From a paper:
In this work, we describe Format Chain Exchange ([name]) as a high-throughput technology that enables efficient combinatorial generation of bispecific antibodies in different configurations for “screening in final format”. Educt molecules are knob-into-hole heterodimers of one half-antibody-like productive side and one knob or hole dummy Fc.
The implemented changes include reverting in CH3 Cys354 and Cys349 (KiH interchain disulfide) back to the parent residues Ser354 and Tyr 349 on dummy knob and dummy hole, respectively. Additional mutations introduced into the CH3 interface are charge-flip mutations between Glu and Lys at position 357 and 370 of the knob or hole dummies. Limited reduction of hinge disulfides initiates an exchange reaction between complementary educts driven by their partially destabilized interfaces. The reaction resolves the flawed CH3-educt interfaces to perfect complementarity in the products of the exchange reaction. Raw samples of the exchange reaction contain not only the desired bsAb product, but also dummy-dimers as byproducts and potentially some remaining educts or aggregates. The C-terminal His6 affinity tag on dummy chains enables to apply a single robust absorption step to remove all undesired proteins from the completed reaction (concept in Fig. 1a and data in Fig. 3b).
Numbering used by the authors:
A (entry chain A): 237 to 443
B (entry chain B): 237 to 445
Write the structure that this text describes.
Amino acid sequence: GPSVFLFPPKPKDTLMISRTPEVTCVVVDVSHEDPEVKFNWYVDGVEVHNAKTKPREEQYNSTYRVVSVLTVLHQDWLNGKEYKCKVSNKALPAPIEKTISKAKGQPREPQVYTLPPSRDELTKNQVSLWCLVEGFYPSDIAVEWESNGQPENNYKTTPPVLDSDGSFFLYSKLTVDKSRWQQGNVFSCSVMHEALHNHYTQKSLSL
Amino acid sequence: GPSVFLFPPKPKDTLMISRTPEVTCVVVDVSHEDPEVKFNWYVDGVEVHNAKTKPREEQYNSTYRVVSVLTVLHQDWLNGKEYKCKVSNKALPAPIEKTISKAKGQPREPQVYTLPPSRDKLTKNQVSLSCAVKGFYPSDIAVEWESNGQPENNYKTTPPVLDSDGSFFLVSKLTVDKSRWQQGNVFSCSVMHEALHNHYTQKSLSLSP
Ligand SMILES: *[C@@H]1O[C@H](CO[C@@H]2O[C@@H](C)[C@@H](O)[C@@H](O)[C@@H]2O)[C@@H](O[C@@H]2O[C@H](CO)[C@@H](O[C@@H]3O[C@H](CO[C@H]4O[C@H](CO)[C@@H](O)[C@H](O)[C@@H]4O[C@@H]4O[C@H](CO)[C@@H](O[C@@H]5O[C@H](CO)[C@H](O)[C@H](O)[C@H]5O)[C@H](O)[C@H]4NC(C)=O)[C@@H](O)[C@H](O[C@H]4O[C@H](CO)[C@@H](O)[C@H](O)[C@@H]4O)[C@@H]3O)[C@H](O)[C@H]2NC(C)=O)[C@H](O)[C@H]1NC(C)=O
Ligand SMILES: *[C@@H]1O[C@H](CO[C@@H]2O[C@@H](C)[C@@H](O)[C@@H](O)[C@@H]2O)[C@@H](O[C@@H]2O[C@H](CO)[C@@H](O[C@@H]3O[C@H](CO[C@H]4O[C@H](CO)[C@@H](O)[C@H](O)[C@@H]4O[C@@H]4O[C@H](CO)[C@@H](O[C@@H]5O[C@H](CO)[C@H](O)[C@H](O)[C@H]5O)[C@H](O)[C@H]4NC(C)=O)[C@@H](O)[C@H](O[C@H]4O[C@H](CO)[C@@H](O)[C@H](O)[C@@H]4O)[C@@H]3O)[C@H](O)[C@H]2NC(C)=O)[C@H](O)[C@H]1NC(C)=O
């Protein structure tokens, strides 16, 4: 029978009020013999009716893939409400039920520190700027770099690491031309997390 | 029927001549009816005879577990030789073969940088010292901290992260009581990797007035 996978919104979508967070229910292996899928959606066990189900679409293993998308309210997600997808198909013994919610646990505020390049490194032609983010919980987070209001996207960020106190830390490494650094340009690490005021902080770094 | 799991040596063990790297071939779900198990070991397809095999040990699920350990030459592992464990048992249709070797790819030398605490952290009680290791390949690496001739307990290291140029980086975070940092104590990040001279390099950090 078919399989169902339920996916959360993007952290940045739940944290920025301008954005629209979505929960996504994906049904795979819908065979031709029975192509019809019914989605029932529930928030905290109360059924809701505003999900939008997409035109089911045929895959190369020649079976079907069906997707329903439910817009969530930012504060519902952040307040820990549970989102249940129920998938009904002729070919199932019983309907499939998947439930998802925000990672549980007492929130803890990220501490954000920018670290300049090592001396050592001032001899190649690029330098590494570092954004250390530590002490946060849960691990859902968004970390971005910019300069003069523009995204600097030539960076890589480690996954969150569980630290000895049960909080998480990570490191974002931004690589820039050494000339940009030596000439005094200002670079900024932006962090978005539920435990921050306005879900947002920015820390800047320059020579 | 029985199942076989073949485990590699730890990276540090292959990089330090004083340590003993081993490949471990583990057989589980050996029956009471057919308890005999034979190991044959091959290095690049050439049979070798010096493995040390343990007596079978019964588990709480009434099956046996049997382990054979092959000591490997550091340089054989680092030169990419293939280690094959072949397991024979009368309950099996044919012997089970498993093969393992070091991760492949052109080695690249890690660059190691220590990063002092942010000033923002100095009013916190504990400060975080950073050891950034970048540009290395393959991802097998060991990173350790010490001070004053003893290891430091209180550090965590990120997994290797694939960078935009195809190499890996990571960072190691050592948390210390702020007094010890202000004290002037020297802390040292040691990195062990196949592409380092002597498979080892160390960088140190202490408060700069
Ligand atoms: C027939 O084919 C289909 C499809 O095959 C694929 O497509 C074809 C064309 C070829 O390219 C194939 O090579 C492909 O495989 C097969 O369907 C697959 O079935 C698998 C099960 O057998 C299933 O495995 C499970 O995957 C989960 C993760 O899936 C993620 O991530 C992968 C990437 O690694 C990706 O392929 C999936 O699409 C899915 O991606 C996420 O999608 C969601 C939904 O859109 C995204 O979230 C939304 O995104 C939007 C913006 O896009 C917005 O942000 C919304 O707000 C947000 O909600 C999300 O961003 C995507 N993430 C990523 C990373 O891409 C696993 O988690 C799961 O693990 C389970 O088991 C684990 C241990 O085993 C457990 O620990 C764990 O808890 C889980 O329980 C499974 O491994 C594949 O996902 C599925 N592929 C697709 C495309 O649906 C089908 O099986 C095959 N049939 C046969 C008979 O072979
Ligand atoms: C009957 O019982 C046996 C025994 O189990 C015990 O007794 C039972 C009754 C219960 O009480 C259990 O709770 C007990 O543990 C069962 O045997 C198990 O069978 C499993 C398969 O069915 C098998 O699963 C596979 O596990 C692999 C990981 O094994 C690691 O890690 C686990 C911990 O997570 C650990 O328990 C294992 O012992 C093994 O530990 C590693 O050992 C190696 C070798 O010693 C270590 O490497 C050496 O270390 C030294 C120094 O320490 C030196 O560095 C050497 O250089 C080096 O070689 C290594 O450090 C250890 N690692 C860790 C983390 O400790 C998985 O990889 C594997 O996954 C793969 O295959 C899967 C499919 O099976 C895939 O899904 C997957 O993707 C992978 O491809 C399996 O999950 C168990 O290991 C095995 N347990 C033991 C103890 O052998 C038996 O199943 C059961 N039968 C029945 C019918 O019920």
